[PDB]
Amino acid sequence: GSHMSCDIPVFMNARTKNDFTWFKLNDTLDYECHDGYESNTGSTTGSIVCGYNGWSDLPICYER
Amino acid sequence: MDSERDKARKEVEEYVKKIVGESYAKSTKKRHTITVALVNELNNIKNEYLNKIVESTSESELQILMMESRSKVDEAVSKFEK
């Protein structure tokens, strides 16, 4: 069922080295911002978690 | 009916992808948590309507479902400021 997995999300100004294309519940994904960009909280990296709702957070970085 | 179902699936997916893309484009550090909530919701709507489409038995039902998906997506977006 659709609430049992998460697709790889769209990235914006960020990369991942994770090579999986879909994720089970509680699986995680690490991202890193492009140089010159930062997360919503000011970090250059983040980790996001697949849940019933979708992703806990999205790999979008913002120009510093 | 197989071809029509495929076209309907593509239309629903493309509209959701468009609106997710617009949500990303306008995101900012301040708006980021809105973007996450909204994008998850849009993908949930997408899955609901793709599932209805796959089991549909008529072309007119497909047209209704495409229209309903678009409306639900637009309604979700409307819950947040532009």
Swiss-Prot record, chain A:
Tissue spec: Expressed in the retinal pigment epithelium (at protein level). CFH is one of the most abundant complement components in blood where the liver is the major source of CFH protein in vivo. in addition, CFH is secreted by additional cell types including monocytes, fibroblasts, or endothelial cells.
Superkingdom per UniProt: Eukaryota
PTM statement from Swiss-Prot or TrEMBL: Sulfated on tyrosine residues. Another study observed glycosylation at this position.
Disulfide bridges in this chain: C6-C50, C33-C61
Swiss-Prot/TrEMBL domain comment: Sushi 1-3 domain represents the minimal unit capable of cofactor activity. The property to discriminate self surfaces from non-self surfaces depends on the C-terminal region made of Sushis 19-20.
Subunit structure of this chain's protein: Homodimer. Also forms homooligomers. Interacts with complement protein C3b; this interaction inhibits complement activation. Interacts with complement protein C3d. Interacts with CR3/ITGAM; this interaction mediates adhesion of neutrophils to pathogens leading to pathogen clearance. Interacts with complement factor I. (Microbial infection) Interacts with West nile virus non-structural protein 1 (NS1); this interaction leads to the degradation of C3.
Annotated disease: Basal laminar drusen: Drusen are extracellular deposits that accumulate below the retinal pigment epithelium on Bruch membrane. Basal laminar drusen refers to an early adult-onset drusen phenotype that shows a pattern of uniform small, slightly raised yellow subretinal nodules randomly scattered in the macula. In later stages, these drusen often become more numerous, with clustered groups of drusen scattered throughout the retina. In time these small basal laminar drusen may expand and ultimately lead to a serous pigment epithelial detachment of the macula that may result in vision loss. Complement factor H deficiency: A disorder that can manifest as several different phenotypes, including asymptomatic, recurrent bacterial infections, and renal failure. Laboratory features usually include decreased serum levels of factor H, complement component C3, and a decrease in other terminal complement components, indicating activation of the alternative complement pathway. It is associated with a number of renal diseases with variable clinical presentation and progression, including membranoproliferative glomerulonephritis and atypical hemolytic uremic syndrome.
Function of the molecule: Glycoprotein that plays an essential role in maintaining a well-balanced immune response by modulating complement activation. Acts as a soluble inhibitor of complement, where its binding to self markers such as glycan structures prevents complement activation and amplification on cell surfaces. Accelerates the decay of the complement alternative pathway (AP) C3 convertase C3bBb, thus preventing local formation of more C3b, the central player of the complement amplification loop. As a cofactor of the serine protease factor I, CFH also regulates proteolytic degradation of already-deposited C3b. (Microbial infection) In the mosquito midgut, binds to the surface of parasite P.falciparum gametocytes and protects the parasite from alternative complement pathway-mediated elimination.
Name of the protein in question: Complement factor H
Organism listed in the record: Homo sapiens
Gene label: CFH
Range of the intact protein held here: 508 to 567 of 1231
